[PDB]
Design a protein around this ligand. Structure first.
Ligand SMILES: [Cu+2]
Ligand SMILES: [Cu+2]
Ligand SMILES: [Cu+2]
Length: 125
C-alpha cells in the first residue's frame, strides 16, 4: 500500500487521511499555496489525538512564531512539519508504531486561527 500523502491548503485539500496499517512509516508532504511569508501567514501540519488537539493548538498559539507555534517539548504532538511560507514545502516522516487502530487522531495547522478550517481526521486502517 502507499505510505505517503500530499497536503496543501486551497482549508486543507483533504479533511481525512487514512494510513494503511501495513505501513511501517508514513510521510506527509505539505506545500504552501499562497504568496505570503510564514510570519504573515504560515502553515504547518500537526498530528495529535483528538482529545489533545485543543491543548496543542491553544498552547501553540501562546508559544508564538519563534517556536513555530508549538509549545516546546509538547509530548502531545505525535508528528509535525515545520511552519512554512510562500514557495516553501516541508515533509514529515513518522513511525506508524505511534498510531493505533481504533484511536481517533486529528491533524491541523497551529498558526493562529487556522485550525478552525485547517483540520481533519487521521485514521489507521
Ligand atoms: Cu505498501
Ligand atoms: Cu508497504
Ligand atoms: Cu495554516
Amino acid at each position: 500500500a502507499e505510505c505517503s500523502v500530499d497536503i496543501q491548503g486551497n482549508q486543507f485539500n483533504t479533511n481525512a487521511i487514512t494510513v494503511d496499517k501495513s505501513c511501517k512509516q508514513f510521510t506527509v508532504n505539505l506545500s504552501h499555496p499562497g504568496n505570503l511569508p510564514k510570519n504573515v501567514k504560515g502553515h504547518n501540519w500537526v498530528l495529535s489525538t483528538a482529545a489533545d488537539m485543543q491543548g496543542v493548538v491553544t498552547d501553540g498559539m501562546a508559544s508564538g512564531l519563534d517556536k513555530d507555534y508549538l509549545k516546546p517539548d509538547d509530548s502531545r504532538v505525535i508528528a509535525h512539519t515545520k511552519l512554512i511560507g510562500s514557495g516553501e514545502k516541508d515533509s514529515v516522516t513518522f513511525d506508524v508504531s505511534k498510531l493505533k487502530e481504533g484511536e481517533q487522531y486529528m491533524f491541523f495547522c497551529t498558526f493562529p486561527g487556522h485550525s478552525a478550517l485547517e483540520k481533519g481526521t487521521l485514521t489507521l486502517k
